[PDB]
Amino acid sequence: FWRAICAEFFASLFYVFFGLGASLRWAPGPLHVLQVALAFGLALATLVQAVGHISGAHVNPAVTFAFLVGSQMSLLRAICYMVAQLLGAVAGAAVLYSVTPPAVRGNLALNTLHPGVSVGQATIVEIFLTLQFVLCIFATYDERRNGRLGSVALAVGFSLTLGHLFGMYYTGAGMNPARSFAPAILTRNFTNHWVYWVGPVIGAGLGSLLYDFLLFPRLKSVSERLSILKGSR
Amino acid sequence: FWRAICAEFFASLFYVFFGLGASLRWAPGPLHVLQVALAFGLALATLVQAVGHISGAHVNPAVTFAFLVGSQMSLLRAICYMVAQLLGAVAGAAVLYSVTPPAVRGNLALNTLHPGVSVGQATIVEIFLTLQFVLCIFATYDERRNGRLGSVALAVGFSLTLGHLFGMYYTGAGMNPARSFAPAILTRNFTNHWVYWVGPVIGAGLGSLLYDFLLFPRLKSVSERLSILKGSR
Amino acid sequence: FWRAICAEFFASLFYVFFGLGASLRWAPGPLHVLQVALAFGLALATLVQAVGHISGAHVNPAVTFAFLVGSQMSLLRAICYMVAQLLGAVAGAAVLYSVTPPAVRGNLALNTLHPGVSVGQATIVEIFLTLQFVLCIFATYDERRNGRLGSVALAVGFSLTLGHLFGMYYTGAGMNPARSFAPAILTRNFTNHWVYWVGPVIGAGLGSLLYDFLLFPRLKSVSERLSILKGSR
Amino acid sequence: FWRAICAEFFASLFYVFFGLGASLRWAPGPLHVLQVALAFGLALATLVQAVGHISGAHVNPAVTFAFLVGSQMSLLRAICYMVAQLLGAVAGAAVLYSVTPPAVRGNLALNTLHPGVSVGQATIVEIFLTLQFVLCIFATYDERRNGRLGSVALAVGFSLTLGHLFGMYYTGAGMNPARSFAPAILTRNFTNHWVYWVGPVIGAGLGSLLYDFLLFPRLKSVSERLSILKGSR
Amino acid sequence: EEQIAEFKEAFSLFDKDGDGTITTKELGTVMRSLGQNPTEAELQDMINEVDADGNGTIDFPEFLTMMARKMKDTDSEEEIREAFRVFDKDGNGYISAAELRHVMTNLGEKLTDEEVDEMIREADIDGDGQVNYEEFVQMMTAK
Amino acid sequence: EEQIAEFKEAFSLFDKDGDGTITTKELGTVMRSLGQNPTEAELQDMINEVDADGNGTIDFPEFLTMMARKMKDTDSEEEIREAFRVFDKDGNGYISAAELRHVMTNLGEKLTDEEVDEMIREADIDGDGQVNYEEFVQMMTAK
Ligand SMILES: [Ca+2]
Ligand SMILES: [Ca+2]
Ligand SMILES: [Ca+2]
Ligand SMILES: [Ca+2]
Ligand SMILES: [Ca+2]
Ligand SMILES: [Ca+2]
Ligand SMILES: [Ca+2]
Ligand SMILES: [Ca+2]
């Protein structure tokens, strides 16, 4: 349980460290977006391969929340996961700052809304981004399906990439409270930050819902859970 | 059956929402194409992972049509699928419009022909695009093959990406009536729209045919199974 | 056997049609290369998924040659495969020409050497390109290995992409006689064409050699061959 | 054992040949990075598919070192592997030089630090790059996990791509002593070269440690196996 | 008569509430006090997999049916011993750690001995490295 | 005595060259006349999988060992009938098309009946849809 917590901590540090790091600079969006979308996507696919078998590789409070309301983890693990993810992100952002030249640092890729995008619109965008994202996670993590899944780590990563390919122009694509938080608390700037917690969380909730439950073919959700009684009985 | 209909509805909304959304703006084609090609491809790969096990993830009237003439679904499911896909697309395009700033809205990525491309040429292009696409879907969905397929969701998605990498310069790449329809009915512009129903539909029909009316091997395949039988004697 | 010949014919038409089509235009190389490299790669990955289980998806004389000297196909199939691939390519190039606006047609993406690259250097480049390519094909097609291969269609496709990411600046990356031939015979331009047959062929030969044989760790190449006697005895 | 040594030799030649070759030129970083990141990533994914089953496809002294301190290979193999990788790289760089036009040769993509990046910061960057890289290798090579891994060759390759997407701006991303060495010894320039041995080596060491000197679970894992046992009773 | 006291307190530990049944609702309470909040539906599925009434209410004797007979079929102690012999390749009253890994790997799960060792010497009475009948019941009835 | 003429001409068809042996070299010639050019090494592997001498020279009687006894062990006609009973789940002298697909799918190859049907009514004598003993030998000895 504590190995998984460490997994979530290191994966979040790496995720944020590489995601933010690859986002430093500018552009109008053209190749900037493609590159940042791929960096985050590949950072996730990499980390999900790295620690997915150890903790499920949530590296995202919204994703963990999704799994909580989905009743796949305890209220205890969830909170520890989010704690590990939040400190993990901050550290990665920190280590990133320490090794990156100023001028290039900018606002450490702080998630930001586009001037012509209202915070309400931006929150709906963040919701759809996280919704398709979580939906892909639930469907691909689902033990009750496919032998033609290929790598679920890549699927999930490419889902994240998709979220960025679309979302960056609108909100820089948060899809992850922890990833938005890290840049926020280190630059002392929480302008519109509410968008980056609310959207993913609601989107994550809708995805978990839209998909759920581990009903009605059931079966390994039942046997994975009779052993959770036998280890407690 | 109704879960699958909902799958096709949500997947089409997401597909169109993210595909169109990532297509907003301009360019000559250079990185614009790469980015939009990837967005659609990854949107599909994502959705095929998300609901492929639930409805087959058609999210495309032409693809559903392909499966109909291929005799893999009932005339009833097909129509319900297309209905769900058409309303699904329109909704995604709608929700997209609602959260996107004007000026950036353009014509909501309405499929459009290139000035130097005749509607006849454009229809042949759309046919080849959908043909290789459907062919990839049939071959990868085919239960009678491969254990080295990897993710069929990605295969299909990358097939869609390929269609865009080539087609966008010609017709903006429709490959999906529903995806072309959505932008059309919301911008009240059906100029050349016939191309985006006819090409995919014919291409989808040719792919379904080319694959199952090739008809199947047989004899090298049989000797490859007697080989595994004496590989056990 | 004739289904496979048709597979090789259609796959070569599609391969060339989409590869050449996505290569029309210019650039210095920057995003042009990335895009064309991906188009060919994804065209192959798509086609290998589409007809790989039916004919092995060679869609490349050099690849078929590789399999011949590798003793995995008969002298009869090889020639029929190459015939199908050559006519297949020409047709795709033809159909491409017919639907593409002039001015954009250029020289139909004819493989061409870079001014500062000697034909000898260009031939060595084409050799290395095809060598890593064929090596990837042999290793991934090899039944004697991996359960962690993922999609061999993508592997092969990405190998082709790699060949382009590197080679396009030098020779436009041929890696396939048929793909070079098609643009050649339709534009009546065989300047340096020898490079595009010799390099891939030698590279293909070296790859087949470098890898070979189907001993060690033997077994299934003996079993997949005793039934080639039993179907002939 | 000697086949594997040859594998490491050829894979390193190919790896460096294609990686360096695709890196020749300039840019600010925009599409240059994306392209070079993909080239290296796909070169690795290709080579890991090509010889991963034969030698484990280390093609990287730091990776081999990682496996040594991880106690998965003998001190003898490791050294032979690194010897093969170093000569392999030099050869690929050599053959690359021989077929590449001057002016384009530059410094043969010699790993280089960014002016505003201290050698200490650059070494920490190289450490994180190699750390996530090795961590992905260990996790994906680990026989004790996943049936949803997909291609581990691609995972590893995309991890390398991620390292480049982030690192190139800082250090050109070495992540591989042999790959840094080759350009170094042929251009007679070892300025800051220490960074490219120390970072990867330490990062590789930390990854090997972080993964196996995490130490392993136990109890949740056991409960998830008693789950499949009562899933059969 | 020590089994009649052990099969009292190994039920009393879960029936603090006196009514003489383990219900799906208290399978929710124990998990809620342990800081979870399950789905409620898949408490019925895991219990009706054994439940003789189909009822989701596992009374004083039916809890001992659930741990020592493991079916809906009155005296399945011999069906526990033939369910041992489906896993064995001899039938010596004892399921080896190796025999458990044989039948698990027969479903294609390519796993290790070290994550079955932790679920034999969680309760192993004779130390031997196989699992006897009374050990198997007590390895689901720790007290 | 019709089997003694059938087991003459079903060898004569491959021994046009008179020396009384089917060799690895003529396994190369027949494939070369049919417009192939095999590797030569894996002619030894496929034959020493059965060859009683280990030799790569399958003389007049040893060719009938290779088609009717199928081991290096003198009178394996009963080992053909127990190799039928490894594939059967009854042993009635007859391997069903269904029993062949059962044992093939037991290795995890999830295939179809239609690509075993193309290799039973290639020689099926009684039409029935199973494979008897003399049918199995003649389905490797077509003449
Ligand atoms: Ca009670
Ligand atoms: Ca009761
Ligand atoms: Ca036993
Ligand atoms: Ca014991
Ligand atoms: Ca003779
Ligand atoms: Ca003899
Ligand atoms: Ca039978
Ligand atoms: Ca019969």
Swiss-Prot record, chains E, F:
Name of encoding gene: CALM1
Positions bearing the Glycyl lysine isopeptide (Lys-Gly) (interchain with G-Cter in ubiquitin) cross-link: K16
Protein name from the UniProt record: Calmodulin-1
Residues that bind Ca(2+) 2: D51, D53, N55, T57, E62
Annotated positions of the Phosphothreonine modification: T39, T105
Organism annotation: Homo sapiens (Human)
Keywords attached to this entry: Acetylation, Calcium, Cell projection, Cilium, Cytoplasm, Cytoskeleton, Disease variant, Flagellum, Host-virus interaction, Isopeptide bond, Long QT syndrome, Metal-binding, Methylation, Phosphoprotein, Repeat, Ubl conjugation
Record: residues binding Ca(2+) 1: D15, D17, D19, T21, E26
Covalent link Glycyl lysine isopeptide (Lys-Gly) (interchain with G-Cter in SUMO2), residues: K16
GO annotation, cellular component aspect: calcium channel complex; calyx of Held; catalytic complex; centrosome; cytoplasm; cytosol; extracellular region; myelin sheath
Subunit structure, interactors included: Homotetramer. Interacts with MYO1C, MYO5A and RRAD. Interacts with MYO10. Interacts with CEP97, CCP110, TTN/titin and SRY. Interacts with USP6; the interaction is calcium dependent. Interacts with CDK5RAP2. Interacts with SCN5A. Interacts with RYR1. Interacts with FCHO1. Interacts with MIP in a 1:2 stoichiometry; the interaction with the cytoplasmic domains from two MIP subunits promotes MIP water channel closure. Interacts with ORAI1; this may play a role in the regulation of ORAI1-mediated calcium transport. Interacts with IQCF1. Interacts with SYT7. (Microbial infection) Interacts with Rubella virus protease/methyltransferase p150.
Activity regulation: (Microbial infection) Inactivated by S.flexneri OspC1 and OspC3 proteins, which specifically bind the apo-form of calmodulin, thereby preventing calcium-binding and activity.
Phosphoserine modification, residue list: S76, S96
Family label: Belongs to the calmodulin family.
CDD domains attached to this UniProt entry: EFh (cd00051)
GO MF annotation: an example: adenylate cyclase activator activity
Entry remark concerning the domains of this protein: The N-terminal and C-terminal lobes of CALM bind to the C-terminus of KCNQ1 in a clamp-like conformation. Binding of CALM C-terminus to KCNQ1 is calcium-independent but is essential for assembly of the structure. Binding of CALM N-terminus to KCNQ1 is calcium-dependent and regulates electrophysiological activity of the channel. The C-lobe interacts with KCNN4 channels in a calcium-independent manner, whereas the N-lobe interacts with the S4-S5 linker of KCNN4 in a calcium-dependent manner playing a role as calcium sensor and gating the channel.
Residue ranges, annotated region (Necessary and sufficient for interaction with PCP4): 71-143
Annotated Ca(2+) 4 binding sites: D124, D126, D128, Q130, E135
Superkingdom of the source species: Eukaryota
Disease with which this protein is associated in UniProt: Ventricular tachycardia, catecholaminergic polymorphic, 4: An arrhythmogenic disorder characterized by stress-induced, bidirectional ventricular tachycardia that may degenerate into cardiac arrest and cause sudden death. Patients present with recurrent syncope, seizures, or sudden death after physical activity or emotional stress. CPVT4 inheritance is autosomal dominant.
GO terms under biological process: autophagosome membrane docking; calcineurin-mediated signaling; cellular response to interferon-beta; cellular response to type II interferon; detection of calcium ion; G protein-coupled receptor signaling pathway; G2/M transition of mitotic cell cycle; long-term synaptic potentiation
UniProt-listed InterPro entries: CALM/Myosin/TropC-like, EF-hand-dom_pair, EF_Hand_1_Ca_BS, EF_hand_dom
In-chain residues carrying the UniProt-annotated modification N6,N6,N6-trimethyllysine: K110
